[PDB]
Write a protein that binds this ligand. Structure first.
Ligand SMILES: C=C1CC[C@H](O)C/C1=C/C=C1\CCC[C@]2(C)[C@@H]([C@H](C)CCCC(C)(C)O)CC[C@@H]12
Length: 129
């Protein structure tokens, strides 16, 4: 019932879609005009480009995403969330290592009543060029 519990549930489906290598399913968790802002990197705009991003990560051999949601605050048709992510991905030596990052993001109640991602700002913890 809680917005926090609703988002954590949505992120649970997010992880399942990714581990099934279903980039379209992953992208369906986003608003059509959603945007991702990786810090010191190019922003990714629109559902299809976001699908391309997650598909690209799958192709790289990125796997086992683990999401840790901190607090979630509701404001009108928006929900504000902060959290952290850990996953397995290739280093500059092509070897698979544990990679971590932090994020804040804004969800929006779509046409349905369900929560969909709208804005995400994220960074990879220092540790590929
Ligand atoms: C993985 C690797 C490690 C190997 C290469 O560095 C490529 C790389 C990219 C990581 C990214 C860049 C794009 C933005 C990402 C994917 C962040 C996500 C957008 C964070 C938000 C995740 C969610 C689902 C909670 O909303 C986390 C990691 C970031």
């Amino acid at each position: 019932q809680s917005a926090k519990e609703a988002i954590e549930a949505a992120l649970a489906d997010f992880v399942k879609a990714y581990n099934s290598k279903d980039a379209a399913g992953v992208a369906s968790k986003y608003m059509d005009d959603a945007a991702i802002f990786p810090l010191d990197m190019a922003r990714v705009d629109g559902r299809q480009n976001i699908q391309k991003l997650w598909q690209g990560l799958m192709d790289m051999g990125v796997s086992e995403p683990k999401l840790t949601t901190l607090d979630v605050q509701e404001s009108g048709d928006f929900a504000f969330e902060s959290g952290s992510i850990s996953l397995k991905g290739p280093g500059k030596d092509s070897k698979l290592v544990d990679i971590a990052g932090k994020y804040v993001e804004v969800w929006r109640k779509g046409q349905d009543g369900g929560w969909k991602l709208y804005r995400t700002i994220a960074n990879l913890d220092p540790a590929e060029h």
